Each structure stands twice: as structure tokens, then as C-alpha cells.
Enzyme design. Sequence first.
Site, PDB file in Angstrom:
ATOM      1  N   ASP A  27      39.356 -36.465 -33.906  1.00 43.71           N
ATOM      2  CA  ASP A  27      37.962 -36.533 -34.358  1.00 43.71           C
ATOM      3  C   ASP A  27      37.892 -37.411 -35.617  1.00 43.71           C
ATOM      4  OD1 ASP A  27      35.208 -35.840 -34.182  1.00 43.71           O
ATOM      5  OD2 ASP A  27      35.431 -34.295 -35.699  1.00 43.71           O
ATOM      6  N   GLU A  53      40.188 -40.383 -30.075  1.00 40.18           N
ATOM      7  CA  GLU A  53      39.042 -40.505 -30.985  1.00 40.18           C
ATOM      8  C   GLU A  53      39.473 -40.793 -32.420  1.00 40.18           C
ATOM      9  OE1 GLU A  53      36.705 -37.236 -31.938  1.00 40.18           O
ATOM     10  OE2 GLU A  53      34.852 -38.033 -31.127  1.00 40.18           O
ATOM     11  N   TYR A 128      40.992 -40.835 -23.492  1.00 41.76           N
ATOM     12  CA  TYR A 128      39.884 -40.142 -24.104  1.00 41.76           C
ATOM     13  C   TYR A 128      38.764 -40.446 -23.116  1.00 41.76           C
ATOM     14  CZ  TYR A 128      36.155 -38.937 -27.401  1.00 41.76           C
ATOM     15  OH  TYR A 128      35.167 -38.304 -28.134  1.00 41.76           O
ATOM     16  N   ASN A 169      37.620 -34.394 -21.285  1.00 38.08           N
ATOM     17  CA  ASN A 169      36.178 -34.045 -21.257  1.00 38.08           C
ATOM     18  C   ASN A 169      35.689 -33.272 -20.020  1.00 38.08           C
ATOM     19  OD1 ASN A 169      34.662 -34.587 -23.650  1.00 38.08           O
ATOM     20  ND2 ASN A 169      35.171 -36.770 -23.322  1.00 38.08           N
ATOM     21  N   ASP A 240      41.635 -30.562 -23.305  1.00 38.59           N
ATOM     22  CA  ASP A 240      42.820 -31.366 -23.458  1.00 38.59           C
ATOM     23  C   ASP A 240      43.900 -30.859 -22.540  1.00 38.59           C
ATOM     24  OD1 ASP A 240      42.230 -32.893 -26.029  1.00 38.59           O
ATOM     25  OD2 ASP A 240      41.379 -30.881 -26.315  1.00 38.59           O
ATOM     26  N   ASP A 265      38.180 -30.579 -34.540  1.00 39.67           N
ATOM     27  CA  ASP A 265      37.457 -29.562 -33.738  1.00 39.67           C
ATOM     28  C   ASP A 265      38.288 -29.293 -32.446  1.00 39.67           C
ATOM     29  OD1 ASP A 265      36.592 -32.148 -32.623  1.00 39.67           O
ATOM     30  OD2 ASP A 265      34.505 -31.565 -32.640  1.00 39.67           O
TER      31      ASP A 265
HETATM   32 SM   LIG Z   1      34.308 -35.892 -31.829  1.00 43.74          SM
END
Ligand SMILES: [Sm+3]
Length: 275
Positions: A27, A53, A128, A169, A240, A265
Site C-alpha cells: 500500500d 502497490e 497486483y 483482488n 493475497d 492494510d
Molecule cells: Sm491500497
Amino acid sequence: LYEDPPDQKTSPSGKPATLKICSWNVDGLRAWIKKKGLDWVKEEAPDILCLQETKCSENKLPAELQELPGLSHQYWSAPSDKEGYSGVGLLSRQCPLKVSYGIGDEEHDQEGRVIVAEFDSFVLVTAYVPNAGRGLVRLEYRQRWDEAFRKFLKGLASRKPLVLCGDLNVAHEEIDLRNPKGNKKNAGFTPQERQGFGELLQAVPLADSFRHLYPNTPYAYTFWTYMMNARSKNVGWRLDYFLLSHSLLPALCDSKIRSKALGSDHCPITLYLAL
Ligand SMILES: [Sm+3]
Ligand SMILES: [Pt+2]
Ligand SMILES: [Sm+3]
Ligand SMILES: [Sm+3]
Ligand SMILES: [Sm+3]
């Protein structure tokens, strides 16, 4: 609600783990370095570290990444128009035989989402995956991405055993998120995304390492929204994964969820293989 079991470091045939891979959606690479993410990695001491990310925007990466003599071979991919969005990283103790970028599909390769690192006995891919978006505005694209990603992996896997890791995701199953009933129409848990995940497993083929080992263990999450202290109430999603060729299942020792590691996060996930 969740305590990851002790690391098992021998494969089923008794062979000791010889390769520790760590994956982590940071993140924001710098924001993460500031939150002490690099110290946790130094403690983890993995052979390969895959980051998603990174959100990097400039002509230089943080100096702290030059202090890693154990993960000296580093590869990076950020959007063509690099502006604090997406971005992946792959740092390895040993030098891969070859590092490529993207999936060989232009429209899917403009957002610095994929890195392929070929090793002697296997190929590693960190990704990602494009989020379907607020209001599912990006769901049609995501399905086009899933389809193209799947086909790319199926082709890589056809030449060498594959290990895919990253923030994919999607919480595949009901057991993969704390609130399945309330998210069936939200990004990450739509029928389209869930089908896409199930289809990736079928077409490559690939096996979900953590679920393969703990098929009935609930409350094992890798992401909690920063909003409303969800990490503390363990209200999360398992986004993940370490997905692997079936041929690599006898080398599998363990797939971990480092629930306690802070800095993002998402918490890191770790794979132990005996190759
Ligand atoms: Sm993020
Ligand atoms: Pt809440
Ligand atoms: Sm195309
Ligand atoms: Sm089900
Ligand atoms: Sm060996």
C-alpha cells in the site's frame, strides 16, 4: 478470531524447505518503509520478496532498498505514466535466469502489475490484479484482464512449474471473507470475480496453497480496511495468495499468513518450498 499455525518446514516426503517466498501488498512502498515494513522483512529473511502497490513516482527508489545484501537482485514495474498508482516489485537473493514484465498483452501491460522471474526449477509471477472498482465500474475490464491473465499463465505453466503470488483482488470463497452475504455485489466478491478465480485454478491448472493445506480453517484473512479498525475486529478478506502448479504440491511445506506484521492494510503471506 485467527492464529496462523506454526511454520511446517519439511515437505510431505520429509525434504526440508529450501525456498522461502514472501508476498506483500505494501500500500505504498515509501509509506510502508516508513511504517517499518523493511524491518519485518529483515526478520522474515525470505529468499524472494514480492511487493504489490508500490505507488512510486520519481527517478529514484528509497535508499533503504540498497541495504538488502540478502535480496540484492531487484526488479520493478510501475505505470507508464508513473503517478502514485499500482506498481510491483520482486527482490531475490539469487539471480533469476530471466525477468520479464507484463503478460504479453499491451492493453493489460500499462499499469505495472506483473513481473515474471524464471528460476531453474520453476517460474515465479507476482501480480497486483486490477480491482473491479467502486460501483463495479471496472468489472467488465477486470473480466477481460482475468481471461488474458489466465491464458498467459497457462502458457508459462506449460513450459515450467508455476508459482503465482500476489494480491489477486478476489476472496475466492465464502470462507475467504468475514462478511460474504453483504459483499456479493462489491468489488472482490462478485460472481464474475469468483468465477474468474475458480477458472484460473482449473485452466492453468493451479492449486491454492493455503486452502489446500487448511481447507476448513476460517477467519484467515490478508486484508482489513483501514476504516473502522477492521483489522482488530478481524473483519477482512483473503486477497493475497500463493497459487501453484500441481506438480509443485509435493514440494509444498507451508503457506503462511503473517497476521501480526504491520505496515499496510494487507499483511504478508509466506510460502516454503523444498526444491
Ligand atoms: Sm491500497
Ligand atoms: Pt466496522
Ligand atoms: Sm490484446
Ligand atoms: Sm461455496
Ligand atoms: Sm534443490
